[PDB]
Amino acid sequence: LLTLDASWVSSASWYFLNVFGLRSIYSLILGQ
Amino acid sequence: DRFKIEGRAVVPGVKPQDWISAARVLVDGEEHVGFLKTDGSFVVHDIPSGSYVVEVVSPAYRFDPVRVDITSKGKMRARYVNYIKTSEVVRLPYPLQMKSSGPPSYFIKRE
Amino acid sequence: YKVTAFPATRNVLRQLHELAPSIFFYLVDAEQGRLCGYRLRKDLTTELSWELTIPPEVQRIVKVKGKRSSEHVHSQGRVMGDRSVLYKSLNPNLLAVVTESTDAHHERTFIGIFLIDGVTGRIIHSSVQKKAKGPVHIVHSENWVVYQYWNTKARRNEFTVLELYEGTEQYNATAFSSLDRPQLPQVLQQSYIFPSSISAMEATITERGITSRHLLIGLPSGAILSLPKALLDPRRPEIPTEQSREENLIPYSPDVQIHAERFINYNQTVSRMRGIYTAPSGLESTCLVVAYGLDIYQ
Amino acid sequence: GTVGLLLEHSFEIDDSANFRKRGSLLWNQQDGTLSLSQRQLSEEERGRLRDVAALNGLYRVRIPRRPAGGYVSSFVPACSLVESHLSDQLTLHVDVAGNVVGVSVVTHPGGCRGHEVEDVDLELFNTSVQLQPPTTAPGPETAAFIERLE
Amino acid sequence: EDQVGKFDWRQQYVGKVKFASLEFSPGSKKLVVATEKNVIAALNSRTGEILWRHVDKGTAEGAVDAMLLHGQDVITVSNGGRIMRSWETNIGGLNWEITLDSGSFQALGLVGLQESVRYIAVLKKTTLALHHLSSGHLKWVEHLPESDSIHYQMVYSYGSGVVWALGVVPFSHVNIVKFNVEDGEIVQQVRVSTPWLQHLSGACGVVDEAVLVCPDPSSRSLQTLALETEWELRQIPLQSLDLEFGSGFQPRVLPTQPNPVDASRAQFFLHLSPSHYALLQYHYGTLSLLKNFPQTALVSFATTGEKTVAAVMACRNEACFNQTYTINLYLVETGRRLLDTTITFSLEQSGTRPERLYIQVFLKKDDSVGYRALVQTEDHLLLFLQQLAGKVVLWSREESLAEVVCLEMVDLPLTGAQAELEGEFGKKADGLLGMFLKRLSSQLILLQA
Numbered sequence A: 001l002l003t004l005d006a007s008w009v010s011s012a013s014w015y016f017l018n019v020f021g022l023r024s025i026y027s028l029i030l031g032q
Numbered sequence B: 001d002r003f004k005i006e007g008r009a010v011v012p013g014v015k016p017q018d019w020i021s022a023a024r025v026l027v028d029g030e031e032h033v034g035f036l037k038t039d040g041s042f043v044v045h046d047i048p049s050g051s052y053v054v055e056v057v058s059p060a061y062r063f064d065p066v067r068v069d070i071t072s073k074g075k076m077r078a079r080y081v082n083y084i085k086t087s088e089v090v091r092l093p094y095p096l097q098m099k100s101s102g103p104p105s106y107f108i109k110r111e
Numbered sequence C: 001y002k003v004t005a006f007p008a009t010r011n012v013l014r015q016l017h018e019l020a021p022s023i024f025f026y027l028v029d030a031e032q033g034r035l036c037g038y039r040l041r042k043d044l045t046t047e048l049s050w051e052l053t054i055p056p057e058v059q060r061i062v063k064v065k066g067k068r069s070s071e072h073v074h075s076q077g078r079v080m081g082d083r084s085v086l087y088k089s090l091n092p093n094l095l096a097v098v099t100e101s102t103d104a105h106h107e108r109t110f111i112g113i114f115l116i117d118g119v120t121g122r123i124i125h126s127s128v129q130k131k132a133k134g135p136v137h138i139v140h141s142e143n144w145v146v147y148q149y150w151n152t153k154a155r156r157n158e159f160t161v162l163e164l165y166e167g168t169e170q171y172n173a174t175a176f177s178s179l180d181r182p183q184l185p186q187v188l189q190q191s192y193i194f195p196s197s198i199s200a201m202e203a204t205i206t207e208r209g210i211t212s213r214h215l216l217i218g219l220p221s222g223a224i225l226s227l228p229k230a231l232l233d234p235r236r237p238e239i240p241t242e243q244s245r246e247e248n249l250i251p252y253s254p255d256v257q258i259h260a261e262r263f264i265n266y267n268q269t270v271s272r273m274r275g276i277y278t279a280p281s282g283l284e285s286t287c288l289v290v291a292y293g294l295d296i297y298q
Numbered sequence D: 001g002t003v004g005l006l007l008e009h010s011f012e013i014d015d016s017a018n019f020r021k022r023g024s025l026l027w028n029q030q031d032g033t034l035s036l037s038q039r040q041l042s043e044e045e046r047g048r049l050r051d052v053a054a055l056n057g058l059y060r061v062r063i064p065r066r067p068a069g070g071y072v073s074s075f076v077p078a079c080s081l082v083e084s085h086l087s088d089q090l091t092l093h094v095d096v097a098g099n100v101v102g103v104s105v106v107t108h109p110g111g112c113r114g115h116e117v118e119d120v121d122l123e124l125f126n127t128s129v130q131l132q133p134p135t136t137a138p139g140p141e142t143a144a145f146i147e148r149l150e
Numbered sequence E: 001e002d003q004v005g006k007f008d009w010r011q012q013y014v015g016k017v018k019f020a021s022l023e024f025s026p027g028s029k030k031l032v033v034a035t036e037k038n039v040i041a042a043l044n045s046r047t048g049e050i051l052w053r054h055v056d057k058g059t060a061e062g063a064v065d066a067m068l069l070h071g072q073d074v075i076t077v078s079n080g081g082r083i084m085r086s087w088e089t090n091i092g093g094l095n096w097e098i099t100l101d102s103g104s105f106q107a108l109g110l111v112g113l114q115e116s117v118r119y120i121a122v123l124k125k126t127t128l129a130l131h132h133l134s135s136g137h138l139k140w141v142e143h144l145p146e147s148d149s150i151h152y153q154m155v156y157s158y159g160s161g162v163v164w165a166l167g168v169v170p171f172s173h174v175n176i177v178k179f180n181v182e183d184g185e186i187v188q189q190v191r192v193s194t195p196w197l198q199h200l201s202g203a204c205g206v207v208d209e210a211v212l213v214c215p216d217p218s219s220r221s222l223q224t225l226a227l228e229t230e231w232e233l234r235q236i237p238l239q240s241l242d243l244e245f246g247s248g249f250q251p252r253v254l255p256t257q258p259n260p261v262d263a264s265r266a267q268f269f270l271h272l273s274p275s276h277y278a279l280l281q282y283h284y285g286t287l288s289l290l291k292n293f294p295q296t297a298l299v300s301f302a303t304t305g306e307k308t309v310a311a312v313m314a315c316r317n318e319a320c321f322n323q324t325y326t327i328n329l330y331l332v333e334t335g336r337r338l339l340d341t342t343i344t345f346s347l348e349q350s351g352t353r354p355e356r357l358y359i360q361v362f363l364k365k366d367d368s369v370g371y372r373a374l375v376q377t378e379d380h381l382l383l384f385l386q387q388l389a390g391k392v393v394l395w396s397r398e399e400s401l402a403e404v405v406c407l408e409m410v411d412l413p414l415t416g417a418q419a420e421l422e423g424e425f426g427k428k429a430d431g432l433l434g435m436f437l438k439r440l441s442s443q444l445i446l447l448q449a
């Protein structure tokens, strides 16, 4: 679809968002 | 005034009694309708003069349509169907020998 | 010409007394070739607003296809390369009247398209396909009109697409009033060849109108072809250009090929088709299709 | 040579039909040209038009079907006609055989905004006139495709 | 993606039945039907599915005019009497197709000789033709005398070796023309005066040995004429039989010729008034009322070889009480109802009545005669009734759906779970604390569930 909004993302974008958002969460469960 | 289109459809390897009970013969897209006999042949009646496109319609087997030209004096000729270049002729036999190219590809494979 | 309301409760009576001058009826008399249009007054009476006449001596009306009142248009414009937008002329009260010539000679018969506005009566478009014959199957939708006919000079079935594109700047992005639209839309037409006859035709409809629009074309052999409307585009250029590549447009090819892989019914042929119904289906990617002729298929 | 078609206008507060003679369209069937000859709006007609613009009424234009035998009509909001200094556009849609099919009235600029106008801006009609036959539709272009095949 | 059958479904239909042929082996489960949609199909007897189907043109050029059955072959005449075809019922294909001469179509019938059916007889307003049976080649064709004024409407023939073409003039004389089969020469011609007679197709009928019989209610009698050994219409009254015609109604004579090569049946049916029939017998000039069926809707015939029987239909307690219809079998040679041969059924709709009735009979294992009845109602519904008790309706087929004119898709009602969402949201509680407890109680009901 070329008409669907750009806000709707595929799975790779979700994975990369999680990769970039869990870096700071790793410091809570771990010692750092 | 009006003439008839004769032909003999045939499927390679399959017997007629296995596919004639579901096929038709359409001239100019249901403008004239005919049905097949037991030996695979077919005849369409009350065809006035002009240029028509005969196609043997069957859900389980595909056939190539053939352009039939019938002059006002009864002379019938056959050729290939080409909507582009409506003047090109490729002489096909007559009575029509419309052999099938096998079952049609209704589906697309996965992946 | 007196209007009866149902349900005729007091609340509906009030909601009509407050909304009367916005309701317009149009009647098309095919035997006389008349097209009258009446305005609803406050006391449920109609006053003649507009009137056109297509003389039956030369043209007879066969189809009057208004656009569905349940469909939605997602994008009010189309990117035309260079990050530029070309806006659509989505007239919500447009009719695409189709007429056929009374002269049925193979050298003088013709088809006629009349894009009219239902409220005012201003004929937005008047076109005549010369040396063409019926029956005429027409699909009218958000912005385009796709009608099929039978070219008698070349003896072949032909599609014709009309797209109603506005300028590069929309007249009014707040509302659409057929009384205050002075600009004439830009009608782009293009004709294609079709290698088979047609028994029915419809277009897929969905709730938001996001997915691609397809044309379900019921052939006389029972098989229901699914032709992408994106293929029936008036902008497909006869010679490629850089903008055609940038917009991902295919050069103009007149042969609209029929491939068996496109039949939405593999071998469940519908003999002697008579109609195709499409429902939005709750999702945004599926359309519920019901083809009814002799056989019923869903 | 030329043929004369009547042209009548109607504007009333009760939105009724009171078509009175406005002018005549001269139509050259041998050439395809269309001209107009009218009578300017009087003081009473201008007053009625201003009152109709106040009441948001309509302005109906009508011509005979044949130069009696029938009427072909259309309408435009009188507000746009008054606020546009009587700048209107008539279009006469005909058939291939030359029969009068439709009349279309347009006001430039379209849309009402309640702009106040003096009487001196309502005593000179500014009417463009057009004749519209049906445009021949295009067919499939095969020659270019045949060359492109090479 | 070759995931068929999961989303799509197709229902095949044939139009309103016009000519049905149930006479068969009948060991084979076949039911050939020609419909009002220019469609010829072979329905299955045991399930009701379409074995094969052939769809002609939907316009008037495809209208099936007549349909006969010989053995496993079905002869069809269509296109205003212009095209004739012979379908083979087993394979579902064609045996031969021919084009008949122009002219209106009036009657079609088989002819034969020497205890064998060999030719087909076609009747047109200008000529009578005889074609072959296994090849379709025209054997001969002969003009009809006085065709400009005499409307020829009947064709009768048996093993005698001659064909009778019967024509009438409205409120005037009738005329019989007897041709020879093997030569086509007009052997005989007869004219009789008839001031009362108005029709020959739906009014008159031939009996055992070329015996033309039909009523005249103007004199309230039956006119008879033995085309073999008579030339005068003997008038027999019905006052002795206590029968009376329906005022302002067109009575009808219904004979039965099981074998198109041998003689007809002396017994026949007489439709005097709507919902009233009478089974009579003709014997050498005199009639004998075998049975009188009052308040009887429909009747049909069958032969199963030599045990020729008839079937009648009537309401149970009544215009019908609860659409409860009972079908019974009688013998033609004597109006004795066959015991243990009653089929009772009911139509689900209110203002629906049966319209057609065809009977397929067979010989039961215990030397008795069993039968299945194909009944077509007003709303184009077809029913195949068997002699059983718990399954009196073998298979039903709603053919009214072959002419869908409108279609709309409505959403199914809300689930029991989605019904609660209207409760907690939209109640418009007075304060925030009230709406809080309301939504909490809704979620509490949900967690309890």
Ligand SMILES: *[C@@H]1O[C@H](CO)[C@@H](O[C@@H]2O[C@H](CO)[C@@H](O)[C@H](O)[C@H]2NC(C)=O)[C@H](O)[C@H]1NC(C)=O
Residues within 6 Å of the ligand: C171, C172, C173, C174, C175, C177, D111, D112, D113
């Ligand atoms: C587009 O059309 C609408 C209405 O047709 C215009 O919005 C205003 O609507 C109110 C009535 O509710 C009225 O004041 C006028 O009809 C409109 N105001 C003016 C100044 O015209 C709107 O102006 C139009 N143009 C745009 C850009 O939205």
Ligand SMILES: *[C@@H]1O[C@H](CO)[C@@H](O[C@@H]2O[C@H](CO)[C@@H](O)[C@H](O)[C@H]2NC(C)=O)[C@H](O)[C@H]1NC(C)=O
Residues within 6 Å of the ligand: B059, B060, C266, C267, C268, E002, E003, E004, E005
């Ligand atoms: C119509 O198409 C469907 C799907 O191809 C056929 O149904 C299948 O037939 C083949 C038998 O060779 C098998 O795959 C299965 O028995 C059927 N189901 C599926 C999912 O494959 C059907 O036979 C075709 N009907 C015809 C050719 O008349």
Ligand SMILES: *[C@@H]1O[C@H](CO)[C@@H](O)[C@H](O)[C@H]1NC(C)=O
Residues within 6 Å of the ligand: D084, D085, D086, D087, D088, D108, D126, D127, D128
């Ligand atoms: C007169 O009509 C033309 C056509 O639209 C318009 O451009 C012009 O502004 C009008 N001038 C006056 C004074 O009305």
Ligand SMILES: *[C@@H]1O[C@H](CO)[C@@H](O)[C@H](O)[C@H]1NC(C)=O
Residues within 6 Å of the ligand: E322, E346
């Ligand atoms: C009518 O017939 C149906 C089925 O036999 C039955 O369910 C129904 O109760 C009957 N009603 C009456 C009044 O007989």
